[PDB]
Design a protein around this ligand. Structure first.
Ligand SMILES: Cc1cc2nc3c(=O)[nH]c(=O)nc-3n(C[C@H](O)[C@H](O)[C@H](O)COP(=O)(O)OP(=O)(O)OC[C@H]3O[C@@H](n4cnc5c(N)ncnc54)[C@H](O)[C@@H]3O)c2cc1C
Length: 498
């Protein structure tokens, strides 16, 4: 049936959009292909931890997988599983694997909570058509407040065993003349203190993050989406995947929507129509819907920029072997708190999160997720044969990202007389993982596929809201940017269009 506004997905762009629509009095239906994560599972918890993965860990796979970097220690806990509507989806393209959340809250369910504003001068470089003053004066602050961003207590951080890993990398980076920064987070750091004191159930301190956190993490279901539901004007239907979008003969948009069970069985196909259609299906999902619509002739006026301009936020993972006298600790909080900021907007830029490892015993490894400035971009191209968007990225396109990460970590190795690990990402010697992405950005780029507020070119009342808007790179963990840009966009769209 008909609803005034439909929002596809329930990640950051979607959640912001739905809240503001509901506050404006616009009845809004959100369609989410994954689950509402609120049912206790076989262990009494909603989510599985990293040491006990089960079918809840994975979107329709037949075996669990170790978190990247951890195979040498966590393969032992892997098990065959039933394909199920689990929370983390590794999406495999030709030469790139992109990890995304599936559920009410999208990637907020599975991410590390790291809530970081981009450098203003870099924002101005990547999005020159956008007014940076309103972003920094108004929209970024609004996003941080509504996301429930908070800051770790420095004394607790300095003293706790749970962050020894971070302090070790800080000291090592310092010998190379590199500084660290604290990283704000949506995980409640007060709660985390009480976890360490044995006062509340552990989550971050029980090797949970990438398959969800049972406690502590303020994912979007607790923040924006709870508020959206609270308006009385928003509803969320789960296990509903939008497949096609067309412009109706009499006005607005019509969607074909598959309803499935948690085993993936098709229960129904429904037609849902609307006046205003907002895409918040992510870089991958929104772009796929639009390349499909263009190439199958249901939105034939979409432009050639739909599909273009994708990048992995320069994501590269690497690891160093510490000296025996610098153990990183058996107990590592699953929520990172420190990064190495070597980002100056030049091609050598690196912003690297000091990543915990989940092994739960001493390994002497320091792990890093580097964000780099690599101009290479990929394109999503529709394959009509399989009805899928395929990402045309090749592994060699990550060479500039590897080069920048390697130059930075080579400085740290030289200053400390340490070497890389080469064995964490497969049997072949490989110090830099260069074919994964946690931060997919682009495919429907702001000002290219859309106007400067995400209005899709060629169409009225059709909007993209999410990471597909970002031109491939923000230089930091992306969700605060996605949220702030969505605040800007929906506020303008409601004022001018609704
Ligand atoms: C392991 C990991 C760690 C990360 N750590 C951080 C971090 O600490 N900080 C940070 O800033 N970022 C982090 N990220 C990235 C961040 O989570 C994403 O950038 C962000 O979630 C993207 O928001 P979005 O709104 O574009 O889409 P998403 O959050 O991906 O949401 C899209 C939603 O749409 C749904 N959907 C897709 N297609 C359809 C369809 N056709 N029909 C219906 N529903 C659909 C999906 O199931 C999903 O729920 C991390 C991500 C991962 C995977």
């Amino acid at each position: 049936g008909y609803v005034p506004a439909v929002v596809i997905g329930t990640g950051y762009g979607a959640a912001v959009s739905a809240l503001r629509l509901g506050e404006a009095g616009v009845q809004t239906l959100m369609l989410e292909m994954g689950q509402l994560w609120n049912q206790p599972g076989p262990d009494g918890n909603i989510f599985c931890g990293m040491l006990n993965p089960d079918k809840r860990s994975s979107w329709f796979k037949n075996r669990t997988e170790a978190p990247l970097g951890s195979f040498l220690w966590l393969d032992v806990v892997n098990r065959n599983i039933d394909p199920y509507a689990g929370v983390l989806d590794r999406v495999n393209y030709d030469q790139m694997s992109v990890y995304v959340g599936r559920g009410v809250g999208g990637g907020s369910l599975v991410n590390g909570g790291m809530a970081v504003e981009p450098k203003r001068s870099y924002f101005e470089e990547i999005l020159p058509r956008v007014d940076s003053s309103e972003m920094y004066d108004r929209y970024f602050p609004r996003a941080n407040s509504m996301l429930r961003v908070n800051h770790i207590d420095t004394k607790w951080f300095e003293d706790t065993e749970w962050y020894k890993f971070a302090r070790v990398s800080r000291e090592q980076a310092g010998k190379a003349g590199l500084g660290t920064v604290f990283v704000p987070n949506v995980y409640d750091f007060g709660y985390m203190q009480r976890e360490a004191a044995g006062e509340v159930p552990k989550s971050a301190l029980a090797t949970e993050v990438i398959y969800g956190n049972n406690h502590g993490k303020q994912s979007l279901d607790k923040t924006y989406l709870a508020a959206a539901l609270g308006t009385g004007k928003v509803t969320i239907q789960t296990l509903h995947q939008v497949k096609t979008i067309r412009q109706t003969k009499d006005g607005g948009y019509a969607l074909t929507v598959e309803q499935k069970d948690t085993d993936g069985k098709l229960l129904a196909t429904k037609e849902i129509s609307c006046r205003y259609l907002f895409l918040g299906a992510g870089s991958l999902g929104s772009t796929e819907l639009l390349v499909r619509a263009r190439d199958t002739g249901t939105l034939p006026n979409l432009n050639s920029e739909v599909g273009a301009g994708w990048g992995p936020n320069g994501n590269i993972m690497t690891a160093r072997a510490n000296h025996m006298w610098n153990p990183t600790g058996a107990h590592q909080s699953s929520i990172p708190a420190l990064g190495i900021d070597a980002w100056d907007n030049s091609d050598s830029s690196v912003f690297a999160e000091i990543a915990p490892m989940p092994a739960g015993l001493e390994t002497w490894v320091s792990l890093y997720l580097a964000i780099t400035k690599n101009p290479q971009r990929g394109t999503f191209v529709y394959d009509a044969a399989t009805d899928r968007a395929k990402l045309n990225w090749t592994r060699d396109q990550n060479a500039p990202a590897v080069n920048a990460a390697k130059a930075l970590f080579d400085r740290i190795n030289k200053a400390n007389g340490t070497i890389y690990r080469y064995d964490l990402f497969g049997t072949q010697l490989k110090a830099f993982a260069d074919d994964f992405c946690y931060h997919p950005l682009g495919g429907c780029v702001l000002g290219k596929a859309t106007d400067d507020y995400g209005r899709v070119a060629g169409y009225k009342n059709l909007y993209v809201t999410d990471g597909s808007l970002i031109p491939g790179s923000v230089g930091v963990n992306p969700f605060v940017t996605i949220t702030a840009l969505a605040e800007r966009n929906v506020e303008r769209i409601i004022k001018q269009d609704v």
